Each structure stands twice: as C-alpha cells, then as structure tokens.
Amino acid sequence: AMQKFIIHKGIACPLEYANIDTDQIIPKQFLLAVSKQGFGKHLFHDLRYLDDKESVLNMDFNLNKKEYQNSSILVSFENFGSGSSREHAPWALVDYGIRAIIAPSFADIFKNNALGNGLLTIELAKDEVLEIVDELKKSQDKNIEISLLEKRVFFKDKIFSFDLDDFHRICLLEGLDNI
C-alpha cells in the first residue's frame, strides 16, 4: 500500500539505538494477518509502554515526549529494521504517521518493504546522522524538511544529500504500488 512522497516537512524524533529490530518495531503478538484498525498503537511497544495494556507511557522514550508529538520523521542509528521479513514493521511505522527514516544504514529486507509501503528510507553518512541527532535534541524546533525530487534533507540551514534507486523513487513520487 503506497502513498506519494514528493516533499515532506514534519516533526523529527531521534532514537539513539542501533540495530532497532523488527520485534522492537512491532512485537509478534500483534502480527494479525488482517486487521481493521492498523498497527500504529503497537509501534515500539516494548520501548513505549511500561505496562502490558498499552496504557502507561515510558516517558524516557522520546516519541512519548511533548516535544516529539506528531512525529513523522525518525532519526536512528545503523542497521535499522534488522531481522527477517516482517511486513507489519513498515505498516506500524506508517500507521503511526512516520513518513521517512534517516539512518546510516537499513537492514536490506526492511528497506525494500518500507519503500514498498511508501516509507522513505534515507541513508546518510554516520557523521551526518550524529550531527542531526545532536542538533535535533538541542533544538526547540523539531521540523526537518525532505525533498525526494532533489534527494535532499533540510534541517535548519544544513543540507544533506541521499541516494535512492530510480524505480523506488519514481514509485514514491507518483504513489505507484509496484514494489
């Protein structure tokens, strides 16, 4: 299920963990083959909730903080999406409202699934990721802007460039369901 991505500006949230795996993204108890409600409530479950009924927030998890309300971009460390195929991992992220993830690298399988689901995966050099995180945390304004046309990320006055296979890119630009 694809959604168009051309230009997006929104609240970015840094998650300073490496190797965020498919179970951290969405645990196995929620991997319903068919649901009506989406999976966003289960995103980052084990990091996000202190209880077992998804009702008590872990306030040490950045996505729970007021400064990160309405996050639509994530900034994480390497090997994001580690694990075997889990189509639900991109689904939980998109259903929560995440449109793009910036990291130094992505697990190959998750990357392709995410791109298939209109979730833009932006690979930056680790130095550039480290710099983003530092500034994002420090800043009152959490907005990052991303142009998939220019293949650039705009944060404050700094500009980063990124790559993406032309086929994946044109699918995201035209919202074509063909991955």
Side-chain angles (χ1 to χ4, degrees):
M2 259 262 200
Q3 199 179 325
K4 192 171 305 203
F5 192 125
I6 301 177
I7 308 274
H8 176 76
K9 169 169 157 173
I11 304 290
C13 183
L15 302 173
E16 293 183 77
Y17 316 91
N19 312 296
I20 283 149
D21 68 38
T22 48
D23 292 294
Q24 299 186 261
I25 297 165
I26 179 158
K28 295 171 167 308
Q29 65 267 34
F30 302 117
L31 309 181
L32 286 170
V34 293
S35 157
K36 282 87 186 320
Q37 21 192 136
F39 300 91
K41 184 177 185 163
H42 311 315
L43 176 71
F44 292 127
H45 176 275
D46 302 334
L47 305 161
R48 169 184 182 183
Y49 300 116
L50 302 175
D51 71 313
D52 314 310
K53 312 291 173 38
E54 304 184 308
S55 55
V56 177
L57 300 184
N58 186 345
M59 303 300 295
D60 206 32
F61 190 53
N62 275 338
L63 283 167
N64 287 337
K65 299 184 186 281
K66 285 214 200 253
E67 289 78 11
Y68 300 111
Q69 271 181 140
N70 271 70
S71 284
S72 63
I73 297 163
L74 298 181
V75 187
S76 206
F77 294 159
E78 49 263 56
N79 194 32
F80 188 96
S82 180
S84 47
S85 196
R86 192 166 290 183
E87 67 213 325
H88 291 79
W91 299 355
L93 287 151
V94 170
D95 290 355
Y96 182 78
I98 304 307
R99 294 284 274 127
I101 302 159
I102 297 167
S105 58
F106 293 89
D108 299 342
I109 292 174
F110 168 86
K111 188 199 295 178
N112 191 248
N113 292 336
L115 288 171
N117 281 264
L119 178 49
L120 182 52
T121 60
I122 294 160
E123 284 174 354
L124 293 192
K126 146 124 275 182
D127 76 296
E128 291 172 336
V129 177
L130 236 26
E131 169 171 20
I132 283 159
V133 167
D134 179 68
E135 171 72 30
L136 191 49
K137 290 192 295 183
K138 290 180 177 169
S139 187
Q140 197 133 22
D141 177 342
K142 302 305 199 193
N143 284 292
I144 292 174
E145 194 166 343
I146 301 157
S147 177
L148 176 58
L149 286 178
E150 288 170 29
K151 297 186 274 191
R152 296 185 151 67
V153 174
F154 303 85
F155 188 35
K156 301 303 199 224
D157 281 31
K158 307 178 172 157
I159 306 175
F160 307 80
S161 65
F162 67 97
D163 281 320
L164 202 77
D165 168 86
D166 281 330
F167 174 64
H168 287 316
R169 165 160 171 276
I170 200 63
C171 293
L172 292 164
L173 296 172
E174 300 288 315
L176 301 169
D177 271 83
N178 310 24
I179 305 191

PDB file of all heavy atoms in Angstrom, residues 144-175:
ATOM      1  N   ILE A 144      12.107  18.814  10.276  1.00  0.00           N
ATOM      2  CA  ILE A 144      13.041  18.561   9.212  1.00  0.00           C
ATOM      3  C   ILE A 144      12.251  18.586   7.905  1.00  0.00           C
ATOM      4  O   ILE A 144      11.080  18.220   7.870  1.00  0.00           O
ATOM      5  CB  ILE A 144      13.787  17.233   9.397  1.00  0.00           C
ATOM      6  CG1 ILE A 144      14.733  17.341  10.613  1.00  0.00           C
ATOM      7  CG2 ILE A 144      14.540  16.871   8.096  1.00  0.00           C
ATOM      8  CD1 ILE A 144      15.454  16.063  11.018  1.00  0.00           C
ATOM      9  N   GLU A 145      12.857  19.084   6.833  1.00  0.00           N
ATOM     10  CA  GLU A 145      12.205  19.007   5.513  1.00  0.00           C
ATOM     11  C   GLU A 145      12.959  18.078   4.574  1.00  0.00           C
ATOM     12  O   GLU A 145      14.170  18.043   4.569  1.00  0.00           O
ATOM     13  CB  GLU A 145      12.028  20.390   4.879  1.00  0.00           C
ATOM     14  CG  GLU A 145      11.058  20.360   3.690  1.00  0.00           C
ATOM     15  CD  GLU A 145      10.580  21.729   3.225  1.00  0.00           C
ATOM     16  OE1 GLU A 145      10.707  22.716   3.968  1.00  0.00           O
ATOM     17  OE2 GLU A 145      10.056  21.810   2.097  1.00  0.00           O
ATOM     18  N   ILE A 146      12.209  17.305   3.778  1.00  0.00           N
ATOM     19  CA  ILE A 146      12.802  16.325   2.862  1.00  0.00           C
ATOM     20  C   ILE A 146      12.171  16.490   1.504  1.00  0.00           C
ATOM     21  O   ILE A 146      10.954  16.501   1.411  1.00  0.00           O
ATOM     22  CB  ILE A 146      12.561  14.896   3.302  1.00  0.00           C
ATOM     23  CG1 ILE A 146      13.143  14.644   4.691  1.00  0.00           C
ATOM     24  CG2 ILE A 146      13.150  13.921   2.242  1.00  0.00           C
ATOM     25  CD1 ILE A 146      12.508  13.460   5.471  1.00  0.00           C
ATOM     26  N   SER A 147      12.999  16.654   0.468  1.00  0.00           N
ATOM     27  CA  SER A 147      12.539  16.657  -0.907  1.00  0.00           C
ATOM     28  C   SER A 147      13.033  15.385  -1.600  1.00  0.00           C
ATOM     29  O   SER A 147      14.234  15.161  -1.734  1.00  0.00           O
ATOM     30  CB  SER A 147      13.081  17.894  -1.647  1.00  0.00           C
ATOM     31  OG  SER A 147      12.703  17.883  -3.019  1.00  0.00           O
ATOM     32  N   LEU A 148      12.119  14.558  -2.078  1.00  0.00           N
ATOM     33  CA  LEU A 148      12.525  13.349  -2.803  1.00  0.00           C
ATOM     34  C   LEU A 148      12.823  13.693  -4.256  1.00  0.00           C
ATOM     35  O   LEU A 148      13.471  12.911  -4.957  1.00  0.00           O
ATOM     36  CB  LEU A 148      11.465  12.263  -2.729  1.00  0.00           C
ATOM     37  CG  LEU A 148      11.708  10.972  -3.511  1.00  0.00           C
ATOM     38  CD1 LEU A 148      12.977  10.296  -3.118  1.00  0.00           C
ATOM     39  CD2 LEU A 148      10.560  10.088  -3.286  1.00  0.00           C
ATOM     40  N   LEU A 149      12.356  14.853  -4.720  1.00  0.00           N
ATOM     41  CA  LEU A 149      12.743  15.371  -6.030  1.00  0.00           C
ATOM     42  C   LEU A 149      14.205  15.723  -6.070  1.00  0.00           C
ATOM     43  O   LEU A 149      14.895  15.342  -6.990  1.00  0.00           O
ATOM     44  CB  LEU A 149      11.969  16.620  -6.390  1.00  0.00           C
ATOM     45  CG  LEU A 149      10.520  16.399  -6.773  1.00  0.00           C
ATOM     46  CD1 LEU A 149       9.860  17.754  -7.056  1.00  0.00           C
ATOM     47  CD2 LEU A 149      10.430  15.494  -7.982  1.00  0.00           C
ATOM     48  N   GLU A 150      14.676  16.451  -5.075  1.00  0.00           N
ATOM     49  CA  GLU A 150      16.056  16.886  -5.073  1.00  0.00           C
ATOM     50  C   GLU A 150      16.959  15.903  -4.398  1.00  0.00           C
ATOM     51  O   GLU A 150      18.174  16.044  -4.483  1.00  0.00           O
ATOM     52  CB  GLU A 150      16.193  18.230  -4.379  1.00  0.00           C
ATOM     53  CG  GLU A 150      15.648  19.366  -5.175  1.00  0.00           C
ATOM     54  CD  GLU A 150      15.598  20.618  -4.350  1.00  0.00           C
ATOM     55  OE1 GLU A 150      16.440  20.754  -3.428  1.00  0.00           O
ATOM     56  OE2 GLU A 150      14.712  21.458  -4.614  1.00  0.00           O
ATOM     57  N   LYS A 151      16.362  14.890  -3.777  1.00  0.00           N
ATOM     58  CA  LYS A 151      17.054  13.932  -2.935  1.00  0.00           C
ATOM     59  C   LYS A 151      17.937  14.654  -1.920  1.00  0.00           C
ATOM     60  O   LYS A 151      19.152  14.405  -1.807  1.00  0.00           O
ATOM     61  CB  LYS A 151      17.820  12.897  -3.753  1.00  0.00           C
ATOM     62  CG  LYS A 151      16.930  12.012  -4.630  1.00  0.00           C
ATOM     63  CD  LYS A 151      17.712  10.860  -5.342  1.00  0.00           C
ATOM     64  CE  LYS A 151      18.330  11.267  -6.631  1.00  0.00           C
ATOM     65  NZ  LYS A 151      18.832  10.072  -7.404  1.00  0.00           N
ATOM     66  N   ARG A 152      17.297  15.560  -1.192  1.00  0.00           N
ATOM     67  CA  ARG A 152      17.941  16.341  -0.122  1.00  0.00           C
ATOM     68  C   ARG A 152      17.100  16.383   1.199  1.00  0.00           C
ATOM     69  O   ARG A 152      15.885  16.193   1.173  1.00  0.00           O
ATOM     70  CB  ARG A 152      18.213  17.757  -0.612  1.00  0.00           C
ATOM     71  CG  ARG A 152      19.222  17.825  -1.779  1.00  0.00           C
ATOM     72  CD  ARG A 152      19.588  19.259  -2.193  1.00  0.00           C
ATOM     73  NE  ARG A 152      20.946  19.361  -2.768  1.00  0.00           N
ATOM     74  CZ  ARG A 152      21.338  18.837  -3.931  1.00  0.00           C
ATOM     75  NH1 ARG A 152      20.491  18.153  -4.715  1.00  0.00           N
ATOM     76  NH2 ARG A 152      22.602  19.016  -4.335  1.00  0.00           N
ATOM     77  N   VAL A 153      17.789  16.604   2.323  1.00  0.00           N
ATOM     78  CA  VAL A 153      17.208  16.820   3.642  1.00  0.00           C
ATOM     79  C   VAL A 153      17.664  18.173   4.173  1.00  0.00           C
ATOM     80  O   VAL A 153      18.880  18.525   4.104  1.00  0.00           O
ATOM     81  CB  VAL A 153      17.634  15.709   4.619  1.00  0.00           C
ATOM     82  CG1 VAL A 153      17.159  16.021   6.028  1.00  0.00           C
ATOM     83  CG2 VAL A 153      17.117  14.354   4.116  1.00  0.00           C
ATOM     84  N   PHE A 154      16.697  18.972   4.609  1.00  0.00           N
ATOM     85  CA  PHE A 154      16.944  20.348   5.009  1.00  0.00           C
ATOM     86  C   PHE A 154      16.641  20.416   6.485  1.00  0.00           C
ATOM     87  O   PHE A 154      15.497  20.172   6.882  1.00  0.00           O
ATOM     88  CB  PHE A 154      16.025  21.315   4.244  1.00  0.00           C
ATOM     89  CG  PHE A 154      16.135  21.217   2.739  1.00  0.00           C
ATOM     90  CD1 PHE A 154      15.391  20.272   2.026  1.00  0.00           C
ATOM     91  CD2 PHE A 154      16.986  22.069   2.028  1.00  0.00           C
ATOM     92  CE1 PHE A 154      15.495  20.187   0.620  1.00  0.00           C
ATOM     93  CE2 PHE A 154      17.096  22.000   0.639  1.00  0.00           C
ATOM     94  CZ  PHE A 154      16.368  21.060  -0.082  1.00  0.00           C
ATOM     95  N   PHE A 155      17.655  20.687   7.303  1.00  0.00           N
ATOM     96  CA  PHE A 155      17.462  20.898   8.741  1.00  0.00           C
ATOM     97  C   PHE A 155      18.188  22.170   9.171  1.00  0.00           C
ATOM     98  O   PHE A 155      19.437  22.223   9.166  1.00  0.00           O
ATOM     99  CB  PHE A 155      17.995  19.719   9.539  1.00  0.00           C
ATOM    100  CG  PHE A 155      17.672  19.778  11.020  1.00  0.00           C
ATOM    101  CD1 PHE A 155      16.463  20.319  11.485  1.00  0.00           C
ATOM    102  CD2 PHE A 155      18.563  19.256  11.943  1.00  0.00           C
ATOM    103  CE1 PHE A 155      16.181  20.371  12.809  1.00  0.00           C
ATOM    104  CE2 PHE A 155      18.274  19.281  13.279  1.00  0.00           C
ATOM    105  CZ  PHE A 155      17.070  19.853  13.723  1.00  0.00           C
ATOM    106  N   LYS A 156      17.407  23.182   9.526  1.00  0.00           N
ATOM    107  CA  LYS A 156      17.939  24.495   9.862  1.00  0.00           C
ATOM    108  C   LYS A 156      18.510  25.001   8.548  1.00  0.00           C
ATOM    109  O   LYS A 156      17.798  24.954   7.538  1.00  0.00           O
ATOM    110  CB  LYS A 156      18.988  24.410  10.986  1.00  0.00           C
ATOM    111  CG  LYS A 156      18.475  23.806  12.277  1.00  0.00           C
ATOM    112  CD  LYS A 156      17.286  24.594  12.748  1.00  0.00           C
ATOM    113  CE  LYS A 156      16.977  24.388  14.208  1.00  0.00           C
ATOM    114  NZ  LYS A 156      15.508  24.226  14.269  1.00  0.00           N
ATOM    115  N   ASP A 157      19.775  25.436   8.550  1.00  0.00           N
ATOM    116  CA  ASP A 157      20.470  25.858   7.337  1.00  0.00           C
ATOM    117  C   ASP A 157      21.383  24.790   6.690  1.00  0.00           C
ATOM    118  O   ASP A 157      22.050  25.081   5.677  1.00  0.00           O
ATOM    119  CB  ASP A 157      21.304  27.105   7.646  1.00  0.00           C
ATOM    120  CG  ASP A 157      20.465  28.380   7.685  1.00  0.00           C
ATOM    121  OD1 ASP A 157      19.271  28.300   8.064  1.00  0.00           O
ATOM    122  OD2 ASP A 157      21.016  29.459   7.342  1.00  0.00           O
ATOM    123  N   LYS A 158      21.402  23.578   7.252  1.00  0.00           N
ATOM    124  CA  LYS A 158      22.220  22.475   6.738  1.00  0.00           C
ATOM    125  C   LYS A 158      21.490  21.569   5.759  1.00  0.00           C
ATOM    126  O   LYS A 158      20.323  21.293   5.933  1.00  0.00           O
ATOM    127  CB  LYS A 158      22.711  21.601   7.869  1.00  0.00           C
ATOM    128  CG  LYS A 158      23.403  22.347   8.948  1.00  0.00           C
ATOM    129  CD  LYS A 158      23.813  21.401  10.053  1.00  0.00           C
ATOM    130  CE  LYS A 158      24.695  22.131  11.058  1.00  0.00           C
ATOM    131  NZ  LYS A 158      24.626  21.422  12.358  1.00  0.00           N
ATOM    132  N   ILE A 159      22.205  21.098   4.737  1.00  0.00           N
ATOM    133  CA  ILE A 159      21.621  20.310   3.647  1.00  0.00           C
ATOM    134  C   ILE A 159      22.406  19.034   3.504  1.00  0.00           C
ATOM    135  O   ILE A 159      23.621  19.058   3.462  1.00  0.00           O
ATOM    136  CB  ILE A 159      21.645  21.058   2.297  1.00  0.00           C
ATOM    137  CG1 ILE A 159      20.987  22.437   2.412  1.00  0.00           C
ATOM    138  CG2 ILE A 159      20.926  20.260   1.251  1.00  0.00           C
ATOM    139  CD1 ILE A 159      21.076  23.284   1.127  1.00  0.00           C
ATOM    140  N   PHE A 160      21.706  17.914   3.432  1.00  0.00           N
ATOM    141  CA  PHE A 160      22.333  16.636   3.246  1.00  0.00           C
ATOM    142  C   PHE A 160      21.753  16.066   1.978  1.00  0.00           C
ATOM    143  O   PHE A 160      20.572  16.316   1.669  1.00  0.00           O
ATOM    144  CB  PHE A 160      22.013  15.753   4.438  1.00  0.00           C
ATOM    145  CG  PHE A 160      22.335  16.388   5.754  1.00  0.00           C
ATOM    146  CD1 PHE A 160      21.462  17.315   6.336  1.00  0.00           C
ATOM    147  CD2 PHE A 160      23.535  16.100   6.399  1.00  0.00           C
ATOM    148  CE1 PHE A 160      21.755  17.921   7.552  1.00  0.00           C
ATOM    149  CE2 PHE A 160      23.843  16.692   7.630  1.00  0.00           C
ATOM    150  CZ  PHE A 160      22.948  17.611   8.206  1.00  0.00           C
ATOM    151  N   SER A 161      22.560  15.321   1.222  1.00  0.00           N
ATOM    152  CA  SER A 161      22.078  14.630   0.016  1.00  0.00           C
ATOM    153  C   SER A 161      22.004  13.138   0.268  1.00  0.00           C
ATOM    154  O   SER A 161      22.757  12.615   1.074  1.00  0.00           O
ATOM    155  CB  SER A 161      23.007  14.915  -1.171  1.00  0.00           C
ATOM    156  OG  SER A 161      24.308  14.382  -0.968  1.00  0.00           O
ATOM    157  N   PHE A 162      21.103  12.452  -0.444  1.00  0.00           N
ATOM    158  CA  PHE A 162      20.976  10.991  -0.363  1.00  0.00           C
ATOM    159  C   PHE A 162      20.660  10.307  -1.716  1.00  0.00           C
ATOM    160  O   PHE A 162      20.187  10.916  -2.660  1.00  0.00           O
ATOM    161  CB  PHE A 162      19.922  10.604   0.699  1.00  0.00           C
ATOM    162  CG  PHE A 162      18.490  10.987   0.345  1.00  0.00           C
ATOM    163  CD1 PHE A 162      17.628  10.059  -0.220  1.00  0.00           C
ATOM    164  CD2 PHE A 162      18.007  12.262   0.602  1.00  0.00           C
ATOM    165  CE1 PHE A 162      16.334  10.411  -0.565  1.00  0.00           C
ATOM    166  CE2 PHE A 162      16.696  12.616   0.272  1.00  0.00           C
ATOM    167  CZ  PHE A 162      15.862  11.684  -0.293  1.00  0.00           C
ATOM    168  N   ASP A 163      20.914   9.014  -1.759  1.00  0.00           N
ATOM    169  CA  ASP A 163      20.659   8.195  -2.934  1.00  0.00           C
ATOM    170  C   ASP A 163      19.351   7.435  -2.824  1.00  0.00           C
ATOM    171  O   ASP A 163      18.899   7.149  -1.736  1.00  0.00           O
ATOM    172  CB  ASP A 163      21.784   7.166  -3.097  1.00  0.00           C
ATOM    173  CG  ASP A 163      23.014   7.760  -3.701  1.00  0.00           C
ATOM    174  OD1 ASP A 163      22.854   8.584  -4.636  1.00  0.00           O
ATOM    175  OD2 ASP A 163      24.134   7.403  -3.255  1.00  0.00           O
ATOM    176  N   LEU A 164      18.778   7.066  -3.970  1.00  0.00           N
ATOM    177  CA  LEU A 164      17.698   6.096  -3.998  1.00  0.00           C
ATOM    178  C   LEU A 164      17.522   5.552  -5.399  1.00  0.00           C
ATOM    179  O   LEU A 164      17.489   6.315  -6.376  1.00  0.00           O
ATOM    180  CB  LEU A 164      16.368   6.719  -3.545  1.00  0.00           C
ATOM    181  CG  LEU A 164      15.323   5.718  -3.050  1.00  0.00           C
ATOM    182  CD1 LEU A 164      15.660   5.252  -1.632  1.00  0.00           C
ATOM    183  CD2 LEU A 164      13.940   6.341  -3.085  1.00  0.00           C
ATOM    184  N   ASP A 165      17.424   4.234  -5.495  1.00  0.00           N
ATOM    185  CA  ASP A 165      17.161   3.548  -6.768  1.00  0.00           C
ATOM    186  C   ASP A 165      16.076   4.321  -7.538  1.00  0.00           C
ATOM    187  O   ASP A 165      15.068   4.668  -6.941  1.00  0.00           O
ATOM    188  CB  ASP A 165      16.665   2.137  -6.385  1.00  0.00           C
ATOM    189  CG  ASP A 165      16.060   1.369  -7.537  1.00  0.00           C
ATOM    190  OD1 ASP A 165      16.821   0.722  -8.276  1.00  0.00           O
ATOM    191  OD2 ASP A 165      14.810   1.344  -7.665  1.00  0.00           O
ATOM    192  N   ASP A 166      16.247   4.568  -8.847  1.00  0.00           N
ATOM    193  CA  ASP A 166      15.264   5.347  -9.615  1.00  0.00           C
ATOM    194  C   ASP A 166      13.853   4.746  -9.605  1.00  0.00           C
ATOM    195  O   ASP A 166      12.857   5.478  -9.616  1.00  0.00           O
ATOM    196  CB  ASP A 166      15.689   5.527 -11.073  1.00  0.00           C
ATOM    197  CG  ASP A 166      16.747   6.617 -11.274  1.00  0.00           C
ATOM    198  OD1 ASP A 166      16.815   7.616 -10.536  1.00  0.00           O
ATOM    199  OD2 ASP A 166      17.498   6.472 -12.243  1.00  0.00           O
ATOM    200  N   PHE A 167      13.763   3.427  -9.602  1.00  0.00           N
ATOM    201  CA  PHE A 167      12.473   2.773  -9.660  1.00  0.00           C
ATOM    202  C   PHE A 167      11.711   3.021  -8.368  1.00  0.00           C
ATOM    203  O   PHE A 167      10.539   3.408  -8.416  1.00  0.00           O
ATOM    204  CB  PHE A 167      12.623   1.277  -9.938  1.00  0.00           C
ATOM    205  CG  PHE A 167      11.347   0.528  -9.865  1.00  0.00           C
ATOM    206  CD1 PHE A 167      10.324   0.804 -10.756  1.00  0.00           C
ATOM    207  CD2 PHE A 167      11.154  -0.429  -8.887  1.00  0.00           C
ATOM    208  CE1 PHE A 167       9.124   0.129 -10.689  1.00  0.00           C
ATOM    209  CE2 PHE A 167       9.989  -1.127  -8.818  1.00  0.00           C
ATOM    210  CZ  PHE A 167       8.954  -0.864  -9.721  1.00  0.00           C
ATOM    211  N   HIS A 168      12.367   2.818  -7.223  1.00  0.00           N
ATOM    212  CA  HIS A 168      11.728   3.091  -5.922  1.00  0.00           C
ATOM    213  C   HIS A 168      11.313   4.545  -5.833  1.00  0.00           C
ATOM    214  O   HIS A 168      10.250   4.857  -5.319  1.00  0.00           O
ATOM    215  CB  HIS A 168      12.656   2.766  -4.758  1.00  0.00           C
ATOM    216  CG  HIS A 168      12.831   1.305  -4.535  1.00  0.00           C
ATOM    217  ND1 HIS A 168      11.768   0.425  -4.553  1.00  0.00           N
ATOM    218  CD2 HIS A 168      13.933   0.564  -4.282  1.00  0.00           C
ATOM    219  CE1 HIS A 168      12.215  -0.799  -4.340  1.00  0.00           C
ATOM    220  NE2 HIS A 168      13.524  -0.742  -4.164  1.00  0.00           N
ATOM    221  N   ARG A 169      12.171   5.426  -6.348  1.00  0.00           N
ATOM    222  CA  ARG A 169      11.930   6.857  -6.251  1.00  0.00           C
ATOM    223  C   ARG A 169      10.728   7.246  -7.056  1.00  0.00           C
ATOM    224  O   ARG A 169       9.888   7.974  -6.558  1.00  0.00           O
ATOM    225  CB  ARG A 169      13.128   7.662  -6.710  1.00  0.00           C
ATOM    226  CG  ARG A 169      12.853   9.152  -6.989  1.00  0.00           C
ATOM    227  CD  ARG A 169      14.181   9.916  -6.958  1.00  0.00           C
ATOM    228  NE  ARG A 169      14.124  11.306  -7.402  1.00  0.00           N
ATOM    229  CZ  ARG A 169      14.193  11.734  -8.662  1.00  0.00           C
ATOM    230  NH1 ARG A 169      14.247  10.893  -9.681  1.00  0.00           N
ATOM    231  NH2 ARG A 169      14.182  13.043  -8.911  1.00  0.00           N
ATOM    232  N   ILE A 170      10.633   6.765  -8.284  1.00  0.00           N
ATOM    233  CA  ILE A 170       9.511   7.163  -9.104  1.00  0.00           C
ATOM    234  C   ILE A 170       8.210   6.598  -8.560  1.00  0.00           C
ATOM    235  O   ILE A 170       7.212   7.290  -8.636  1.00  0.00           O
ATOM    236  CB  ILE A 170       9.695   6.856 -10.612  1.00  0.00           C
ATOM    237  CG1 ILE A 170       8.743   7.719 -11.473  1.00  0.00           C
ATOM    238  CG2 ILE A 170       9.496   5.356 -10.931  1.00  0.00           C
ATOM    239  CD1 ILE A 170       8.938   9.326 -11.443  1.00  0.00           C
ATOM    240  N   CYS A 171       8.219   5.364  -8.047  1.00  0.00           N
ATOM    241  CA  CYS A 171       7.052   4.830  -7.332  1.00  0.00           C
ATOM    242  C   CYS A 171       6.613   5.769  -6.203  1.00  0.00           C
ATOM    243  O   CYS A 171       5.452   6.117  -6.154  1.00  0.00           O
ATOM    244  CB  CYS A 171       7.301   3.410  -6.817  1.00  0.00           C
ATOM    245  SG  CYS A 171       7.464   2.152  -8.142  1.00  0.00           S
ATOM    246  N   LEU A 172       7.531   6.225  -5.341  1.00  0.00           N
ATOM    247  CA  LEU A 172       7.172   7.122  -4.241  1.00  0.00           C
ATOM    248  C   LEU A 172       6.682   8.467  -4.779  1.00  0.00           C
ATOM    249  O   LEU A 172       5.684   8.985  -4.318  1.00  0.00           O
ATOM    250  CB  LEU A 172       8.361   7.355  -3.304  1.00  0.00           C
ATOM    251  CG  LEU A 172       8.831   6.151  -2.474  1.00  0.00           C
ATOM    252  CD1 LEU A 172      10.219   6.375  -1.896  1.00  0.00           C
ATOM    253  CD2 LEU A 172       7.873   5.896  -1.382  1.00  0.00           C
ATOM    254  N   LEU A 173       7.390   9.032  -5.764  1.00  0.00           N
ATOM    255  CA  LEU A 173       6.950  10.308  -6.338  1.00  0.00           C
ATOM    256  C   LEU A 173       5.543  10.264  -6.971  1.00  0.00           C
ATOM    257  O   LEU A 173       4.766  11.205  -6.861  1.00  0.00           O
ATOM    258  CB  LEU A 173       7.972  10.839  -7.385  1.00  0.00           C
ATOM    259  CG  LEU A 173       9.387  11.216  -6.919  1.00  0.00           C
ATOM    260  CD1 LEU A 173      10.243  11.511  -8.156  1.00  0.00           C
ATOM    261  CD2 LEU A 173       9.427  12.425  -5.934  1.00  0.00           C
ATOM    262  N   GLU A 174       5.208   9.174  -7.642  1.00  0.00           N
ATOM    263  CA  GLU A 174       3.897   9.061  -8.269  1.00  0.00           C
ATOM    264  C   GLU A 174       2.901   8.243  -7.443  1.00  0.00           C
ATOM    265  O   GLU A 174       1.762   8.081  -7.847  1.00  0.00           O
ATOM    266  CB  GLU A 174       4.059   8.454  -9.671  1.00  0.00           C
ATOM    267  CG  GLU A 174       4.936   9.260 -10.595  1.00  0.00           C
ATOM    268  CD  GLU A 174       4.261  10.540 -11.035  1.00  0.00           C
ATOM    269  OE1 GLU A 174       3.070  10.452 -11.385  1.00  0.00           O
ATOM    270  OE2 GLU A 174       4.900  11.628 -11.029  1.00  0.00           O
ATOM    271  N   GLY A 175       3.328   7.723  -6.300  1.00  0.00           N
ATOM    272  CA  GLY A 175       2.474   6.874  -5.461  1.00  0.00           C
ATOM    273  C   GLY A 175       2.006   5.651  -6.233  1.00  0.00           C
ATOM    274  O   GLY A 175       0.806   5.361  -6.284  1.00  0.00           O
TER     275      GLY A 175
END
